[PDB]
Subunit: 334 residues, 4 copies
């Protein structure tokens, strides 16, 4: 079927002066955290997945107030995930199936994704996403300040190539059973130049030559056991130094670190807060699964509630952000 | 950003012949038979870790073809013709990506040579197998491939499971690099279903594709932190496959983590499989073997017929290993 | 530079159910006139060129009332021509929508499709001249009648194009009056052709067309005017000799009025007289009309042409009443 | 149906150093003629249409010997016409239907046309053709030293735009009834820059901005009456100067100047030969319909015989060229 190329969506929704400026600078600001030049804490926070742009915009307006408030301690960027990797099968996100009913209206979904990202950046909220597909990025990577490569794809050569050509910093998650070396290796690969086949903005396949991405880091997201504590952070930091790549890392409070219990994301954040207080020198960022309303639901019946992984609600979100900001204020004072 | 010819340009210059088309169609059907337990021959995916020299490849194929015919009642021999290689971090990604082996990345030439070699192989009677790594290169030559692999590093990847769901050949999913078998079992489940995703057409344009699912996927045991080739591991995998409601017939890789990356250990693994086939071995439908004209590996392509990637057994050792497997499977089939 | 393909525009501006029905119906009604099943007179009327969407909609709202009023005698369809072909030298609303040498073709094609959809949606069907081989895919779905101009009637590329169009097509005689080239064009366009074209996705392809059975000639003058009974009778003779339809359209403007735009009325009266006497070979007329009569080099006066001079609204009422009255009498025989 | 783009053909049949040099040199030589820097006579000579590459190459090998023999007096370039305009319907040429059987194998036809042109340039014979289609030129214009726009398309805006973007000199024929102003007007238009839609080497439609073609001229090819004589040449020269364009022009010995009778081309050439002897300062070239065997045939039964317009045969061709060379040697001595 008949896919509109990126240029069609770029013509309807060109990046504005403000969005372009916000993306450019947030990427720069994140590079400084990745390389230990600034000691603010990157916070990637928001829904497991976007299934309703309206709830997403409401969420973003609340989050914007806290982004501003804590701007000296925390660098807040919203989770805006449009592509979801499933264990076997299931809804792959808003792009793949925006009407949430098996109609796979991908043109509508890409348009909605771009429109949401443009609106977010226009309001002052930078955005992040996981890059899962090789073709979808040309539709909206210009509006992304930070990207993730998921646990299920960190070891994949086509995803490392993708990352090597992205203009934003990229986090690589450790593997689903806890393997960190694949992520360390991914930084090596993505940091170098690659030649590979991709698709242009006009929608045609082409040979691209990337320059490499100097702003990649790892993300600790648990395995058979959680890997967020000081002992794990120290082990990982030594392995990063050994490989000659940045030893500054991100810690995901959710997924296999909370072991799929949204109420434990706060516990993880408190452990991180104590590391920042005691030392915490290898930590540059945290990831949190958060929505307007806590929990999850199989069907999109309740507004502002996840249909994928369970999230903390808005009030726990305010608490969690206050805790990290206070803890990092103390770290930054040393 | 450089000037890629679309699949239709290569297809025009190198159209599939009646003979190649018959060989592919038959070989896929025969392999399907093995996957679903209808025939008890052993699929043998055998040849170089990587193809870097089409002359040496054609010579290899010539020698192998005699053995394919000789052992045809006990073994279904298909050549490894791997054109895309995953690197640990960085390095030469294969003949397609850089066919002149010097960082000129002449991909139009690479794709052309890959198709030419596959067409020449099928025309001489040797079916071909490859690892599908890239999302766009398959359209250039998948019509000439009888069996496909998704590698250990990409079995968990949703975009690779999608690709597999639209392939017309049977597909083997390798267990993960540390030993995880569940990802490959999950992959069979995923690739067996219909998917909708973005891909590139034969004309070189991006499009929405809707696949029908691939009913002929299976797992490949290739070792992890510890090897997983033995009877206990096979029995344990078979139980997991049945619990997930997918085929309990599997393939065993003698190389990579099952040989502890020591090419001289491939024969020990094959000897263990032979022993399983003689005793029972009902869940084994195939084996994988990294093999070339000359054993070992080299950083540079100085020696003819010697791998520049993973180390391989040599030709003599290939005769030994194939004879061992054909003997042992003859007995399995007899009962 | 970076051309959006037709599918980008078709996505933002899908044809409505109402527009689709109007185009479908009007094409058929026109075909009925081309082949003598109905004796209403097609009238292709409106500006020489469209340079202002706002004025074009205002003109359409006025024309719509007369379209309905005269519907038993006349089939009124608006002229929505975006440009000229030049002898040489403003390059039309598509090729240059900002009227300033910036050639913003993406914007121009978008604006063209937008206007055509709005026109169809209000009940006014639209006609245009197809000048190039690529632009038609962006809006031919909104066109009820197409023209091939005098300067391109003889061209094999344009005959091919016409053979694949889903609307009826009029071929103008040559710039110096040559009628044979238009007669030959109908014959060429009625057949199947294989040739290279561009798809709605923006890619070159081989297309195989089925032929267009609803083509006709248009008399637009030359070395001398060719609107009178004598010239109409000779054309009809030549048409029947070539085995194609002997129903034709008369352009009141261009080389039939020459240097006086007000002569369109005289041509129209001569046509009225033919209709009253007999006039059996006339299926249509073309008229260059706008809100305000005349022309201007620069777009200062609202609703006045910036290409060829046009009769104004009051004279348009006059000319349509005249034609409707005359054709009423022809249909009553 | 499934059209290979130009790049597919360019990859299989890249232009050689030799062909590239011959085309560059020949284009420059022809420009010098159009602008009166040189008084050699351009001679565009060969079949009405190509229906058989084998005969065309045999024809070229004979013509090369004369090309070389007359090089100080004549600039001989072969007619290699692959696209034919029909009065109503009929075979449109080798590209459109190479197997001459209603199969329209256009991929094969383009491949065969490019192959022939490359072979011709490689043997030392430059080539000319009529550019009828908007899309086919990308496949082989790099191998063409001179182009024609036909009588039936000279008045066409799209053909004038096409001409404005070509790298070769272009001749515009007067209209089919004898109108010369359309060709004079065409030179005007094709000398300007244009913006229009075209198709790329990769097979995608795009906006192209051409720089104008400063090497255009008119071709006198007859109308109701012929227009080859001194008086018509003299009339056309005055109008060229009046429009401010080159008053050097080309005369077609065939088509409407021969009343469609192949035995009259020699009479036209003889008239031209007298003008060249008397004065003939405004003539820069001639066009002649020539083949191995004279006349025409309905089916491709006889080898080297036209299936379109009737042509003079090889013997008459030698006579005609000797005549023009002898006459122009004298013009050039003054
Ligand atoms: Mn999640
Ligand atoms: Mn290997
Ligand atoms: Mn006009
Ligand atoms: Mn001819």
């Amino acid at each position: 079927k008949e896919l509109l190329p990126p240029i069609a969506h770029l013509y309807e929704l060109p990046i504005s002066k403000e969005a372009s400026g916000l993306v450019h600078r947030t990427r720069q600001e994140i590079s400084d955290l990745v390389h230990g030049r600034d000691k603010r804490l990157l916070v990637i926070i928001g829904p497991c997945s976007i299934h309703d742009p309206k709830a997403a915009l409401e969420y973003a307006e609340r989050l914007l107030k806290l982004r501003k408030q804590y701007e000296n301690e925390l660098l807040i960027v919203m989770r805006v995930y449009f592509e979801k990797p499933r264990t076997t099968v299931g809804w792959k996100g808003l792009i793949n199936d925006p009407h949430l009913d098996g109609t796979f209206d991908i043109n509508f979904g890409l348009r909605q994704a771009r429109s949401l990202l443009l609106s977010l950046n226009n309001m002052g909220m930078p955005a992040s996403t996981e890059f899962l597909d090789m073709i979808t990025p040309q539709y909206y990577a210009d509006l992304i300040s930070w990207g993730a490569i998921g646990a299920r794809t960190t070891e994949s050569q086509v995803h490392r190539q993708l990352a090597s050509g992205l203009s934003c910093p990229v986090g690589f998650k450790n593997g689903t059973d806890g393997n960190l070396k694949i992520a360390i290796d991914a930084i090596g690969a993505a940091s170098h130049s690659h030649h590979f086949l991709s698709v242009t903005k006009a929608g045609h396949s082409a040979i691209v030559h990337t320059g490499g991405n100097p702003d990649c880091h790892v993300i600790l997201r648990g395995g058979k056991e959680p890997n967020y504590d000081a002992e794990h952070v120290s082990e990982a930091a030594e392995q990063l130094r050994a490989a000659g790549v940045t030893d500054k890392l991100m810690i995901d409070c959710s997924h296999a670190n909370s072991r799929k219990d949204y109420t434990r994301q706060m516990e993880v954040a408190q452990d991180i807060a104590a590391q920042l207080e005691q030392d915490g020198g290898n930590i540059m960022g945290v990831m949190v699964e958060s929505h307007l309303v806590e929990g999850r639901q199989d069907k999109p019946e309740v507004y502002g509630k996840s249909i994928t992984d369970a999230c903390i609600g808005w009030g726990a979100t305010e608490e969690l952000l206050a805790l990290l900001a206070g803890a990092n204020k103390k770290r930054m004072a040393r």
